[PDB]
Amino acid sequence: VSKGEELFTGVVPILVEMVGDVNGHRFSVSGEGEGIATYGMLTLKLICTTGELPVPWPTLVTTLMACFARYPDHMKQHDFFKSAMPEGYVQERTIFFKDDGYYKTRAEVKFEGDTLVNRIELKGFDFREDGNILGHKLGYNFDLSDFGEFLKMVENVRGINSHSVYITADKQKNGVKAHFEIRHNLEDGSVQLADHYQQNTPIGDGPVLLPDNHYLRHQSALSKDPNEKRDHMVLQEFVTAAGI
């Protein structure tokens, strides 16, 4: 009913493009898949098109679409991310890795005709060649210490620890913001903290629903395509809103 809902109504094709430079190690990632807001579901296959990804794939999960979360009927007024469509929104993060480097990220999420686009620039700085990021020491998971076709999607995510990020309004920016923590596991059994600060602004001039403070609840699953030669990641995210 409200701005930009009808654009999400079925199966929306996704395009993700990313270019990155972490300590001078240059890389590109492209990818495609599908968002289904009615399920709060996202599925992607993202490929490193330049060869070996120089950071661990788990560290880019958050960077590589809150518009595909499913907002319940009582909360459709708080859906900032759909309300900004089709023109879209700039998503900006700082990510601090404890006792290591950090990422700066800037992405534009928007409709390019039918296709929902996440076009990203990533830089990162002050990493240790030998540390957990440029060392590739993180495990490959995101386990943070229609009734039918849908239940197939939910099967892959049942059991995974949920992760809740609080979304707050920023009136000055006519946007939203969030602070959260991602605790990556390592193989050795300890944790790698990734301290996320996020800012989202509309690309359009005209106004938006600035939401009451609510949470987005995620479960993410990382897998592989068994027929894919390249360095790659399959990511599925189940995202719903609550708490207001």
Numbering used by the authors: 5 to 68, 72 to 152, 208 to 306
Please quote the authors directly.
Compared with YTnC, YTnC2 had 5.7‐fold higher molecular brightness and 6.4‐fold increased dynamic range in vitro. Finally, we obtained and analyzed the crystal structure of the fluorescent domain of the YTnC2 mutant.
Genetically encoded calcium indicators based on truncated troponin C are attractive probes for calcium imaging due to their relatively small molecular size and twofold reduced calcium ion buffering.
